[PDB]
Design an enzyme around this catalytic site. Structure first.
Site, mmCIF file in Angstrom:
data_model
loop_
_atom_site.group_PDB
_atom_site.id
_atom_site.type_symbol
_atom_site.label_atom_id
_atom_site.label_comp_id
_atom_site.label_asym_id
_atom_site.label_seq_id
_atom_site.Cartn_x
_atom_site.Cartn_y
_atom_site.Cartn_z
ATOM 1 C CG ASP A 35 -13.417 -7.552 1.115
ATOM 2 O OD1 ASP A 35 -13.209 -7.119 -0.032
ATOM 3 O OD2 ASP A 35 -12.542 -7.588 2.022
ATOM 4 C CB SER A 199 -9.578 -3.106 -17.858
ATOM 5 O OG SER A 199 -10.195 -2.100 -18.635
#
Length: 330
Positions: A35, A199
């Site tokens: 994770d 992004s």
């Protein structure tokens, strides 16, 4: 040193991925959820409340000659889905794919919430976010990666998750045969303890690319892709009959649909998520309403590039002095 381990979907939907991890001496192999959005290595154990264990493999520190109680240390964590666990702490030898760390903090669960109990396939989590998020008190502990880092050939790990198939976590090297083209690296902020990056935009299907900054985290522990409501609305508007369902808890779509791809930007590069990756199947057995793999982050407080996005790429978690993230197509 290096390590290399196969990671395997827990079910036919890629709801999570499990990776075998050796703990203790002799080894006890548990299947952990790696994770990159948390920083605790915790396991079901011989100390876990009996009624809260249902089919998981447990770590028994009393059977490990290298286990040592970390005296006074406790831990307690809550995750983004509302699940939680807590307990005490041992140190022990932990190996992943041939890479061994001695003195790793292994957090033994005394209590786990129902979602953990109900999932027989996950024996614990192995956190790969920054150690500043580790919950051990009064002495915060380091992640497996942080402990291994100085010994690694290169201070990196990579995630190569499969779509409805196994994939690979590598430590200490970049497998240049595992991706196509080049890896595009992008800046990371560690201020919130995550692999947080920006992004450069998105496209829906064959549509034009929208240049827009989207801050979010690369999180292997999260199943889905969570993005701003504007972006998510633009995606689902291209699917006939798709709608946001308050009762179901997100966007659903007719199971008869063909889903468009979703593209996200990494610098000037582009990662394309095929439409099929965005299908999470019937909302309940036999239903013709299917759950979407792209959902709104509104009310989470952060955008999350979870498995839906990451499994479309070969992803480099570069833990150099100034960390960065790399993405390649594959």
């Amino acid at each position: 040193s290096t390590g290399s381990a196969t990671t395997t979907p827990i079910d036919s939907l890629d709801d999570a991925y499990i990776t075998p991890v050796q703990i203790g001496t002799p080894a006890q192999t548990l299947n952990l959820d790696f994770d990159t959005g948390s920083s605790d290595l915790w396991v079901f154990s011989s100390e876990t409340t009996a009624s809260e264990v249902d089919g998981q493999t447990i770590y028994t520190p009393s059977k490990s000659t290298t286990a040592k109680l970390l005296s006074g240390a406790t831990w307690s964590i809550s995750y983004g889905d509302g699940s939680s666990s807590s307990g005490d702490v041992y140190t022990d030898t932990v190996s992943v794919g041939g890479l061994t760390v001695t003195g790793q903090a292994v957090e033994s669960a005394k209590k786990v919430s129902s979602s953990f109990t109900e999932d027989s396939t996950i024996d614990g989590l192995l956190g790969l976010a920054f150690s500043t998020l580790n919950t051990v008190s009064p002495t915060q502990q380091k992640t497996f990666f942080d402990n291994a880092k100085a010994s690694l050939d290169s201070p990196v790990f990579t995630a190569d998750l499969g779509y409805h198939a196994p994939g690979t976590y590598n430590f200490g090297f970049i497998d240049t045969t595992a991706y196509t083209g080049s890896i595009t690296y992008t800046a990371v902020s560690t201020k919130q303890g995550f692999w947080e990056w920006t992004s450069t935009g998105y496209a829906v299907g064959s549509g034009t690319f929208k240049s827009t900054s989207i801050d979010g985290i690369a999180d292997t522990g999260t199943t889905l892709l969570y993005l701003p409501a504007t972006v998510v609305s633009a995606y689902w508007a291209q699917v006939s009959g798709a709608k946001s369902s308050s009762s179901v808890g997100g966007y659903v779509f007719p199971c008869s649909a063909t889903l468009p791809s979703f593209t996200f930007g990494v610098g000037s590069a582009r990662i394309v998520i095929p439409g099929d990756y965005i299908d999470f199947g019937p909302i309940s057995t036999g239903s013709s309403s299917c759950f979407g793999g792209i959902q709104s982050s509104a009310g989470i407080g952060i955008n999350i590039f979870g498995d839906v996005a990451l499994k479309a790429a070969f992803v480099v978690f570069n833990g150099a002095t100034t960390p960065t993230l790399g993405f390649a197509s594959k």
